[PDB]
Amino acid sequence: ATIGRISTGSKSLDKLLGGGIETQAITEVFGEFGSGKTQLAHTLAVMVQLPPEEGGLNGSVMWIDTENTFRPERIREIAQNRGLDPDEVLKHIAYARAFNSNHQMLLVQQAEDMIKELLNTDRPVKLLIVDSLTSHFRSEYALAERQQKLAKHLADLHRLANLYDIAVFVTNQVQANGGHILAHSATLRVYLRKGKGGKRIARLIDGEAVFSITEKGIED
Template identity: 50%
Template sequence: KPKSIEDLSGVGQAVLNKLIDAGYSSLEAIAVASPQDLSVAAGIPLTTAQRIIKEARDALDIRFKTALEVKKERMNVRKITTSSQALDGLLGGGIETRTMTEFFGEFGSGKTQICHQISVNVQLPPEKGGLSGKAVYIDTEGTFRWERIEAMAKAAGLDPDTAMDNIYYMRAINSDHQIAIGDDLQEFIAKNPSVKVVIVDSVTSHFRAEYTGRENLAARQQKLNKHLHQLTRLAEIYDLAVIITNQVMARPDMFYGDPTVAVGGHTLYHVPGIRVQLKKSRGNKRIARIVDAPHLPEGEVVFAITEEGIRD
């Protein structure tokens, strides 16, 4: 099965360039194109357009499925423990593979600590709530600390050096760099199939900082959406978990509104996945709440951030 447009059969470099120039740079874009549009835009025969559209749809498994098939697909989803039973319960058992999970909340609400914890816990054997896998950690804010990995790994009964060796870390310097890393991830993970979680902490900060002002909102959103869809595809193709974080200001006056809309952007609104809002509580306690997940009951749970990591 093709994993990107480069793999489509009978598509040489010339046609590939035409497709990309015409904006059909992903399997998704091709899968939902009309044969006529694609044929004209890329200057290829109609029959070729029809053929590659079909191939793209097959690759993405776009077809009618029975509900039973959908159920069976979902049963294959695997879960990574957060080290808090309450938080796992809220998430329906833990962080899911084939899914993008977003943690959003104010500064200090625990987003980065959860990312550290998952990059350790993914390494645990399945009977302890892991996937015996490795982690990719993309850090945009410079808040990754190996000391925290060491402490959490020890507390989880893992050898700290081995645990650190199983985390592929990259600092993203700006949004273009972040997107370029995203572009390269597919190849990286194809070569390193033991990677079972990809973390981007935070996914939004560079975009917010670089695209300021109303007039830049649309451009920002377009770039961010492309990046997010890329990550979603990774989750689906490689059966891995994707975790993103998103810092939003606490706005007590907006308590009843959607907190992400309140800070100027339907940031991650149109991308499927699970969204978890984090809030500070007393001391080391934090509150987690699921936001608009179709299959999970609404509710709040309390967890704690300790020296050993995330706990109940």
């Protein structure tokens, strides 16, 4: 399949990303608590449902939450302000909460079943969000076992991205008092941070985009 792109909702961030986040790729966004990673996730879950002319892929969404931070009311607001029917947008986001890291792994296997079911339809899965990817692994394991467990989990996610032409979008909290970037395992690493005046700044790791969090999700 060709490489699809999902607009982030910000023209600035889209330019930095070459058009948006890619299918057949894992995009890892990392940064401090409060930097806007989950807002980017919420916005992408709407944007992917737009037609390609507006930067979407007419796609369905699967969301794996580890911290109870998915907000249907926020999806509704973004959808309404992006010109979509919010009820339809929410109907096309399959939501699951991971109880622990082992359940998180099983949820990725279950995601494959729904990806297969929708593969030949007009609303195939095009976006799999894992927010937060690392939190359970950090709480449950010391570093050595944590690295081995993370490696298999990321291998599973890569495989889904390539085999089924999906964008995998993962968030990762890293700040002075804890957290660690997923090393070299993502396809693409994006560093997000707060700037003056409520702005958010993104940079590719291994120019900078600037955007705001608004009723449209994020935008320039």
